[PDB]
RNA sequence: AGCAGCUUUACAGAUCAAUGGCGGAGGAGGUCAACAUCAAGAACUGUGGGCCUUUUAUUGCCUAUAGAACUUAUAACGAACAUGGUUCUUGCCUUUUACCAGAAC
């Protein structure tokens, strides 16, 4: 009978013990970056008007469309301010 | 994994693994693409007893089965380097928070989800709102909003499929 | 071990009963699996268990502590071997 | 003759362990037991 | 569920039809049996070969 | 992946005085040591891999399970994206 | 403990007709014997009622009720443990017996 898979299914027949030894002796940005910069800056302007958006909800006190009215007002600010950065730093 | 000893026997172990993921509960039993069954199992007990109902009373068929796997899950150490597009809609993935796996594991309408975000987990707040789903410990989020709303379902049912088969 | 053809240390050896898969390249080596491991889990170790009889699991572990040994020690003591009950 | 030859080496050694090798160890009773099993089976054959 | 057979060697076999095993020989025939015929209502089977005489044999003790 | 047997060789190691259970209801998964993308890692075909070669062994060794790769043809970004763009991304450093 | 109730196998006193209650008209053993029974739908008989079978003799099922000794769940009279036959597959072999050692009946 086999141990651990090695010895004879039996020592009968093999003309031998049978007995099993272990064997001592074996032993330029890529332009994808670029790209994510550039939507991560436009994300930022995104991410203050939607806490702005947050804010004007949350205190309950302006209708939808003036809420949305303010946040296209800054976000066209934020855009220009952010657009004009650009224009600068490329220069 | 297994498979049957004689594929002629092949429904007869069909039959027998239906009644297995009836009688086993928290036995999940499934078909791989390869045509190879799947096993998954809470211990070597409980796959020692699933095998011998399979093998004794409900198969009656000799079996051949592998030596014991895991299930492994595919995840990003982190943030993706570029925002490269596909054809045949380009996506981004971060590792996930430590606290939100954790809380997720665990199991624990928009404007209270995005408060339980920006307060525990400090999220901004257009992550806070864009959350489209949470599938299998993993989060889908969004960020003209009309433009993207046509598809969300199917956008999410990408996403879904994606997550249960990794790259 | 006498129906499976191994034979764990010190047990008896007898005539075998019976004379893409699991190929190397395909299988993930983390444990050998001792034979020990097949008449412990014999339905989940081996592939063609006939004639296996499953075996009994286990017994809770023994906690008999001993005695008769020091004449006038008593029945009911705290014998050195035992945790303090510290609270 | 086996079985024994067998008990007798499981008997020795508990026997001897601090008294070495020769004479002295009487415990017959397992292999008295072999050899009535031995003729148990006999009897039903010599009587034959 | 029995099936007799009876062969020039001189024997006379009882198989049972269960599991396709001899378990029962009738020991009698002096050379090659060539006939064997069952009882319609009796335990009992007829053989009959080269030696000239038919035997009628008990299936379950096996007695001629 | 490395509990098969160990509470069989507890219970042995210890002459019976001496048991386990095993159980998976905190969910904890965590990474497997070394790099999934490491082409190059060393993987014996009989004994146990380094640990340095977990990841790729286990990456490759599910792929040719499932018959997805026929070999040391493992996962790249290549699959998905343009082959032109592949062969960009590799002479950046970010994926060879 | 004292007091009270219920109960009566005993003792005493009173009573002592009938009726009722209660109890009764061998025991312990035997390296004695005979007979019966002991491995199965977890798997037992009888009495009573219904249906079927049976054809004067009883079987099976359902239902009601009474009893179920011994043996058995990491299954079995035996906390133990021999041999033989047939068949198959092996061993040593030089043919049989006698044998090797696994299986099945
Ligand atoms: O041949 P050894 O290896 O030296 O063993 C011998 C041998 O026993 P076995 O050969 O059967 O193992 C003797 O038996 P015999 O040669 O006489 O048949 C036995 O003496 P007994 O006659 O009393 O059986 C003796 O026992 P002792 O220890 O008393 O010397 C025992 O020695 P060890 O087994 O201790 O080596």
């Known amino acids: 009978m086999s141990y651990n898979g090695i010895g004879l299914k039996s020592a009968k027949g093999s003309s031998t013990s049978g007995h099993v030894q272990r ?22 302007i995104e991410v203050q008007v939607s806490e702005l958006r947050d804010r004007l909800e949350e205190e309950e006190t ?3 469309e003036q809420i949305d009215k303010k946040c296209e007002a800054l976000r066209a600010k934020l855009t220009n301010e952010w657009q004009e950065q650009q224009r600068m730093s490329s220069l | 994994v ?5 594929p002629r026997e092949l429904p007869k172990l069909l039959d027998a693994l239906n009644k297995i993921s009836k009688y086993y509960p928290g036995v999940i039993i499934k078909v791989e693409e390869s045509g190879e069954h799947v096993i998954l199992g809470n211990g070597e007990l409980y796959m020692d007893c699933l095998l011998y109902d399979l093998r004794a009373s409900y198969a009656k068929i000799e079996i051949k089965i592998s030596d014991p796997l895991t299930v492994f899950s595919e995840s990003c150490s982190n943030e993706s380097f570029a925002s490269i597009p596909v054809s045949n809609i380009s996506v981004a993935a971060e590792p996930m928070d430590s606290k939100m796996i954790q809380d997720l594991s665990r199991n624990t309408n928009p404007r209270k989800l995005s408060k339980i975000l920006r307060t525990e987990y400090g999220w901004d707040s257009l992550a806070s709102r864009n959350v489209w789903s949470f599938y299998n410990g993993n989060v889908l989020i969004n960020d003209s909003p009309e433009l993207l709303s046509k598809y969300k379902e199917q956008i999410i049912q990408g996403f879904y499929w994606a997550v249960k088969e990794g790259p | 071990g006498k129906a499976l053809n191994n034979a764990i240390p010190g047990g008896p050896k007898f005539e075998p009963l019976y004379p893409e898969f699991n190929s190397i390249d395909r299988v993930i080596f ?11 889990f014999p339905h989940l170790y081996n592939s063609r268990p006939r004639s296996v009889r499953i075996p009994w699991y286990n017994n809770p572990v023994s906690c008999i ?3 008769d040994e020091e004449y006038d020690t008593p029945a009911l003591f705290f014998d050195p071997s035992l945790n303090p009950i510290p609270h | 003759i086996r079985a024994c030859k067998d008990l007798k080496h499981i008997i020795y050694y508990k026997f001897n362990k601090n008294l070495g090798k020769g004479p002295g160890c009487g415990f017959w009773q397992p292999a008295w037991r072999v050899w009535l099993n031995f003729l148990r089976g006999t009897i039903p054959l010599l009587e034959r | 569920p029995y099936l007799f057979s ?4 001189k024997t006379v076999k009882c198989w049972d039809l269960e599991k396709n095993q001899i378990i029962r020989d009738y020991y009698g025939h002096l050379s090659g049996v060539r006939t064997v015929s069952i009882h319609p209502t009796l335990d009992l089977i007829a053989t009959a070969g080269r ?7 008990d299936m379950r003790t096996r007695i001629p | 992946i490395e509990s098969a047997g160990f509470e069989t060789d507890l219970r042995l190691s210890t002459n019976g005085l001496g048991m386990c259970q095993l ?19 060393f993987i014996p075909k009989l004994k146990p891999a380094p640990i340095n070669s977990l990841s790729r062994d286990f990456v490759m060794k599910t792929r040719r399970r499932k018959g997805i790769s026929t070999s040391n043809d493992g996962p790249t970004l290549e699959k998905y994206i343009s082959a032109e763009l592949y062969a960009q991304l590799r002479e950046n450093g970010l994926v060879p």
Request: proline share 5%; net charge positive; glycine share 2%.
């Open chain 1, 23 to 44: 064997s001592l002796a074996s032993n330029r940005p890529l332009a994808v970056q670029k790209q994510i910069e550039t939507h991560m800056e436009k994300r930022e």
């Open chain 3, 65 to 67: 502590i001993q005695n």
């Open chain 2, 2 to 6: 297994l498979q049957p000893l004689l």
């Open chain 6, 23 to 41: 159980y998976f209801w905190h969910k904890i998964w965590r990474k497997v040591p070394g790099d999934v993308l490491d082409k190059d890692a």
């Open chain 5, 51 to 57: 030696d000239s005489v038919i035997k009628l044999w």
């Open chain 1, 62 to 64: 302006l209708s939808e």
């Open chain 3, 30 to 40: 983390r444990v050998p699996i001792r034979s020990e491991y097949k008449v412990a």
């Open chain 5, 6 to 9: 009876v062969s020039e060697d």
